[PDB]
Amino acid sequence: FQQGLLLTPVPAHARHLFFTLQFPEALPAALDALLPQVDGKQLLLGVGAPLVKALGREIPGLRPFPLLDAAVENPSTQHALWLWLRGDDRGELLLRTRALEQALAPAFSLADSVDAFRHRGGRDLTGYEDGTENPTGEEAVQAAIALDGSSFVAFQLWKHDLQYFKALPQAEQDNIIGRRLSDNEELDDAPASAHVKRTAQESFEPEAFMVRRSMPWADGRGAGLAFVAFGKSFDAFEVQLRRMSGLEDGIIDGLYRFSRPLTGGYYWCPPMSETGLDLSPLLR
Amino acid sequence: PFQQGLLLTPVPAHARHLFFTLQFPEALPAALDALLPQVDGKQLLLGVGAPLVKALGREIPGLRPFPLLDAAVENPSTQHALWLWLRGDDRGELLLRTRALEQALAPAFSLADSVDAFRHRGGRDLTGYEDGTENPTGEEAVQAAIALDGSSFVAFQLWKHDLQYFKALPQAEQDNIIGRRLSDNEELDDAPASAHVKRTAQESFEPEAFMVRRSMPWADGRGAGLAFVAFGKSFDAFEVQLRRMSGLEDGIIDGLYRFSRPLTGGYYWCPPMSETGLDLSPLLRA
Amino acid sequence: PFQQGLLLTPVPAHARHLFFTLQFPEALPAALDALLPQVDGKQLLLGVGAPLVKALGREIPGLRPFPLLDAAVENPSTQHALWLWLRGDDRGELLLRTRALEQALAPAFSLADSVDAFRHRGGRDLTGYEDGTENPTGEEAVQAAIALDGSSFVAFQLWKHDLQYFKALPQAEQDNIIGRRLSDNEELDDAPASAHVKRTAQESFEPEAFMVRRSMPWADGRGAGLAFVAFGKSFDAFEVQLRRMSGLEDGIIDGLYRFSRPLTGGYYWCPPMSETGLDLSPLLRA
Amino acid sequence: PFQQGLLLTPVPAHARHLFFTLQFPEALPAALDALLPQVDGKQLLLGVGAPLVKALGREIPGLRPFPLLDAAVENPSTQHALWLWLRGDDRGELLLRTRALEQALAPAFSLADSVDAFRHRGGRDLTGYEDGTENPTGEEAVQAAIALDGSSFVAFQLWKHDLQYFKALPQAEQDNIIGRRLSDNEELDDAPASAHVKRTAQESFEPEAFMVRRSMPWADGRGAGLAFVAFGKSFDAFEVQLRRMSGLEDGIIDGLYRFSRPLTGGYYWCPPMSETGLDLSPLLR
Numbered sequence A: 001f002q003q004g005l006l007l008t009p010v011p012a013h014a015r016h017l018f019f020t021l022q023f024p025e026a027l028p029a030a031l032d033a034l035l036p037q038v039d040g041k042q043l044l045l046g047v048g049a050p051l052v053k054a055l056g057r058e059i060p061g062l063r064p065f066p067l068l069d070a071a072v073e074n075p076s077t078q079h080a081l082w083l084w085l086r087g088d089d090r091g092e093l094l095l096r097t098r099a100l101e102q103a104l105a106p107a108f109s110l111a112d113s114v115d116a117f118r119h120r121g122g123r124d125l126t127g128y129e130d131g132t133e134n135p136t137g138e139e140a141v142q143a144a145i146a147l148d149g150s151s152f153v154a155f156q157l158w159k160h161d162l163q164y165f166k167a168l169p170q171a172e173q174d175n176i177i178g179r180r181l182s183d184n185e186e187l188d189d190a191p192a193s194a195h196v197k198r199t200a201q202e203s204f205e206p207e208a209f210m211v212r213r214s215m216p217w218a219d220g221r222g223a224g225l226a227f228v229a230f231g232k233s234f235d236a237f238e239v240q241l242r243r244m245s246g247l248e249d250g251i252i253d254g255l256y257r258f259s260r261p262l263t264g265g266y267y268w269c270p271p272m273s274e275t276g277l278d279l280s281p282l283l284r
Numbered sequence B, C: 001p002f003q004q005g006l007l008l009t010p011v012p013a014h015a016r017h018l019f020f021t022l023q024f025p026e027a028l029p030a031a032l033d034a035l036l037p038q039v040d041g042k043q044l045l046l047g048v049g050a051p052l053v054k055a056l057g058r059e060i061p062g063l064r065p066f067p068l069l070d071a072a073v074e075n076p077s078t079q080h081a082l083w084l085w086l087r088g089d090d091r092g093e094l095l096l097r098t099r100a101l102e103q104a105l106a107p108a109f110s111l112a113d114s115v116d117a118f119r120h121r122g123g124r125d126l127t128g129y130e131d132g133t134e135n136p137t138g139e140e141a142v143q144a145a146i147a148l149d150g151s152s153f154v155a156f157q158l159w160k161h162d163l164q165y166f167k168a169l170p171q172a173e174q175d176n177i178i179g180r181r182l183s184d185n186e187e188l189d190d191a192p193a194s195a196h197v198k199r200t201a202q203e204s205f206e207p208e209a210f211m212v213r214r215s216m217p218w219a220d221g222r223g224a225g226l227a228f229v230a231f232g233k234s235f236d237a238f239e240v241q242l243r244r245m246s247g248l249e250d251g252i253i254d255g256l257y258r259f260s261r262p263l264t265g266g267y268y269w270c271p272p273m274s275e276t277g278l279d280l281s282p283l284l285r286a
Numbered sequence D: 001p002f003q004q005g006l007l008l009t010p011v012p013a014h015a016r017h018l019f020f021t022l023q024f025p026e027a028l029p030a031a032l033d034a035l036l037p038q039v040d041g042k043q044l045l046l047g048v049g050a051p052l053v054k055a056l057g058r059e060i061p062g063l064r065p066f067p068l069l070d071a072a073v074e075n076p077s078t079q080h081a082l083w084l085w086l087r088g089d090d091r092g093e094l095l096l097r098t099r100a101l102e103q104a105l106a107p108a109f110s111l112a113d114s115v116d117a118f119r120h121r122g123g124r125d126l127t128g129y130e131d132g133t134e135n136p137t138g139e140e141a142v143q144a145a146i147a148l149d150g151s152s153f154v155a156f157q158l159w160k161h162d163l164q165y166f167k168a169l170p171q172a173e174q175d176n177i178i179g180r181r182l183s184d185n186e187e188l189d190d191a192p193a194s195a196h197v198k199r200t201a202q203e204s205f206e207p208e209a210f211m212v213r214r215s216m217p218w219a220d221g222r223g224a225g226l227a228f229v230a231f232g233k234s235f236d237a238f239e240v241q242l243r244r245m246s247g248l249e250d251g252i253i254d255g256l257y258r259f260s261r262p263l264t265g266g267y268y269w270c271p272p273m274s275e276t277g278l279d280l281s282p283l284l285r
């Protein structure tokens, strides 16, 4: 009843599209072209707070990406629509992008774009395995899917300073992540600022589990990780980010030593029906 | 006791805005020792962002990050730690001063964003419209922009224009978006409420929302538009204006959003000037 | 005794082309010490450009810079000193290898150009047409691409496609530009003389102009198109083909120039392989 | 009867170079109808490249594509069909004029390259050295730049500087690369033969290689450097200079290549002016 956000491993190639609603009067023609194409597998769709506000509607649990008043930067760059394309090669995704652009215009204007790819079967560009402690199976459904079959996804485009980080001694890299790069073993003696120490899913009250589908990226803006986290609500992601940002106990996550998010967005993933994507709470 | 430059009558012919992230806080003293003697408030202005204050465990009354507006239009919040405003003679001089500031601020600060700005004609937006007609001048500008202690609070947005769409509209449709006539800059009393000058009428707020604007056009690989800059004695004037423009006051959205949208957003505290340079004392005391 | 990976069909799913300028030739020995142990001719291929040979005061028979064609279409000559062809499993591996090669090759070499390439739909151009159908295979490929001493001479062009224009044409007009039918790749004998496969028919030259092509699609901020690569036992095959495509043989210009244009052009000598690595002796002897 | 603006010294504070590819030559008439009335030779100069002439099956004496130098340094040849030189008061005016020229010139022409250029400190390179000290002036400039029929032949290269490397050199080493003293622009008679002014000494050639340079610094995403422009009554002066700079005359390479390298290269024919606009008659019967 949900989309294909739980399919593991992440595809070898993906592309993230973010649109601004520039001409709301042309919205019906855009939806008529877009909605029949959203199968939740090769094409996923997320709805942003501006689109809901433009329709004068309300989605329980939906809100723009938050504003954290911290010593580290987490920008809020909320858009109206997020499209997640998954495919076989980057050329297919490029041609599919052009078709979606022309089909969504003039109602929607493309505001941002990111090509993403799987690295070495699921590693960050720093080399560390990504997704080790993700919930799987039925635990993944309970962490990511709400009762009505919808999901709430958070997105950040993290930009890595690879030259600084990879020039550190391997023990210093391991103390930033909280795991050993050589064999992915957890470092129990890592400082409290270590990433996996900051984001330990069982260390929150209530527990802050989420389903992450992050993928590395690289273009003219640099290189890093396209962070994606699916949850039954934004509660899990938001308390994690606030602890990572030092807003819980004053200790800042080690990731901010070498990486920084360039964007931030919240999106509501609608459920699927027997006849396509179920946007009924928005179109009545 | 302010920094001046921000009140200097016309905008300089060329300027450059630099935005830095506080990447290594342990190296901050050396960066400040190199930077502060160069801040004269005329050729080089400085603004302090909320992350820098938070990293020092201090607090500046009136300072906060760029707000989050839950509206039908997009106003992103992209707050950085430090804002440097270079004003100069040519773009090459500003480029060379930029490189020198980068080496002096490193490794404590990492350059996060940059925009070259230039004066167009006598002070016009790239659409052709005059910019600054109803700005406060003289003592009214000081009262609107400068707080009692001599500091100022500046808001910044990098607006990106869709010039092809806007300039292809009939001139009457362009005029109804701005609220003034491009042919002679006359105000249109019969413009719809969504017109920009109707949305931002400084006397139509309670209390009055006057501010001192120093916007300048820009153009690079990201496109072209207006680098919007608004100085105030507090952020109240700018923020109540932006919320009305975004339709959060009465449901009417400003006409600017038909062809333009901001890519960035930042709040910065402009410290006052003392007899011996920039006064950063509320951040460097005990 | 050649660089085996130039005959590998199909091309790997991901590759990256690097082009370096010899910026400080006095620092060449340290760069070669780091580079040569990595050149296996499979995951990393190497080509030597005429500027590098001239900087050493030597000569390579068959090597010369990319030619200058005085035609009505543009084939720019952007010859560099070194060409590296990286092939790998995913784009991230090639990115990390690029950074390592950049730091190891410095300061002697400066990276002048870079292109990420990928296989599309099993070996198709971004326009949809199959690429490589009439490539020589087996022993014929060796005879067309490999010189007697085991070296090869490779020509490179970065072609930029106007996909919106081309794909908006009626399918019959697209087919007459390529010379083959998109529906089933069958050759059109009744295509106009300007059709690509009519221009480049390898048996229609005297002597025959066979070559081994390893082109791969590309896409970045500059646009999208085909990273054209042609291996030959000499540059004779490629050059007579390009001159006919450019209308310098019979006044008829190839149809590809209706929607695509090369942004770069380079000639590079691929040295032979020995039992213990790349054989650069004709360049570092005596 | 030339395009006045090419002798205007100093160059205006802001300019923009546009280079177009002839993508659809059948659509050329509508493009020329829109373009030619705008070419005054002052705010808008025009140069014709060899591909445009070849596409019309014509020939211009003295015109040819940018040469191919087989040297140890890189001078790329990136010849285009059309060169437009916009000059104005601010970068925004040039930006709006560029968009208008793009829409008017399409679909025949496609914009292939663009460079914003600006005057630095009254006429200095970004390295600080004065640029234009030994340019011909007055009637000597006319004799060096203008052919008999009033046309000119202009060479263009987009030079990219490595300012970090160059400005980190000792001041004596910087001076030996240029051949002049940065403090007061005095000529260094004891500078090495590789020094720029020693390589390019206009009187040290037979015949003499004088030309009128109108170079201006530039800066965008590709870096920063000098947009080199040289006007001559023919291409002989520029080409014999460049071959010496590249070490093809005596094996000595110009010191500029230690910190700078050209990214583009083009030759263009600047048609003469008549009393009623640009004279393209040798190209349109």
Ligand code: HEM
Binding pocket: A124, A128, A129, A130, A131, A132, A133, A134, A156, A158, A177, A179, A195, A196, A199, A200, A201, A202, A210, A225, A227, A237, A238, A240, A241, A244, A255, A259
């Ligand atoms: C540059 C950005 C990031 C990088 C490179 C990164 C990388 C990693 C790595 C290598 C692990 C350990 C392997 C694993 O369990 O998957 C991990 C764990 C985790 N990360 Fe991140 N991550 C990033 C951002 C984030 C953010 C922003 C959040 C939440 C707001 C987050 C939440 C988590 C969680 C929940 C875990 C699992 C913790 C556990 O072991 O229970 N990650 N991350």
Ligand code: HEM
Binding pocket: B125, B129, B130, B131, B132, B133, B134, B135, B157, B159, B160, B178, B180, B196, B197, B200, B201, B202, B203, B211, B225, B226, B228, B238, B239, B241, B242, B245, B256, B260, B261
């Ligand atoms: C693309 C962005 C913008 C453009 C092109 C633009 C342009 C203009 C123009 C042409 C005028 C009329 C001439 C003048 O009074 O100076 C004006 C007035 C004004 N604008 Fe904007 N502006 C932009 C953004 C903003 C924003 C974001 C704000 C506030 C949050 C703002 C506040 C004002 C105010 C206060 C006035 C004077 C209104 C009055 O007459 O009292 N502007 N603007």
Ligand code: HEM
Binding pocket: C125, C129, C130, C131, C132, C133, C134, C135, C157, C159, C178, C180, C196, C197, C200, C201, C202, C203, C211, C226, C228, C230, C238, C239, C241, C242, C256, C260, C261
């Ligand atoms: C935008 C640039 C180009 C594209 C999209 C392209 C595409 C194609 C396609 C679709 C074919 C037919 C299938 C095949 O046999 O491979 C082909 C054939 C061929 N191409 Fe190209 N090509 C390009 C540039 C070039 C250039 C510059 C040359 C030579 C200088 C060249 C040489 C050949 C040859 C020799 C053949 C085989 C001809 C034969 O049937 O005997 N190609 N190309």
Ligand code: HEM
Binding pocket: D125, D129, D130, D131, D132, D133, D134, D135, D157, D159, D160, D178, D180, D196, D197, D200, D201, D202, D203, D211, D226, D228, D230, D238, D239, D241, D242, D245, D256, D260
């Ligand atoms: C990065 C590229 C270049 C830079 C920064 C540069 C800069 C300079 C400077 C500082 C001078 C001395 C002051 C003056 O008399 O103008 C000069 C002189 C000169 N340059 Fe260049 N130049 C460049 C490229 C070229 C090229 C490519 C040519 C010719 C092909 C050239 C030809 C000349 C000539 C003829 C002179 C005058 C020599 C004399 O007779 O004294 N320049 N240039």
Ligand SMILES: [Cl-]
Binding pocket: A003, A044, A045, A046, A084, A153, A269
């Ligand atoms: Cl989704």
Ligand SMILES: [Cl-]
Binding pocket: B111, B112, B113
């Ligand atoms: Cl940056």
Ligand SMILES: [Cl-]
Binding pocket: B014, B091, B118, D091, D118
């Ligand atoms: Cl400028």
Ligand SMILES: [Cl-]
Binding pocket: D128, D182, D183
């Ligand atoms: Cl000086």
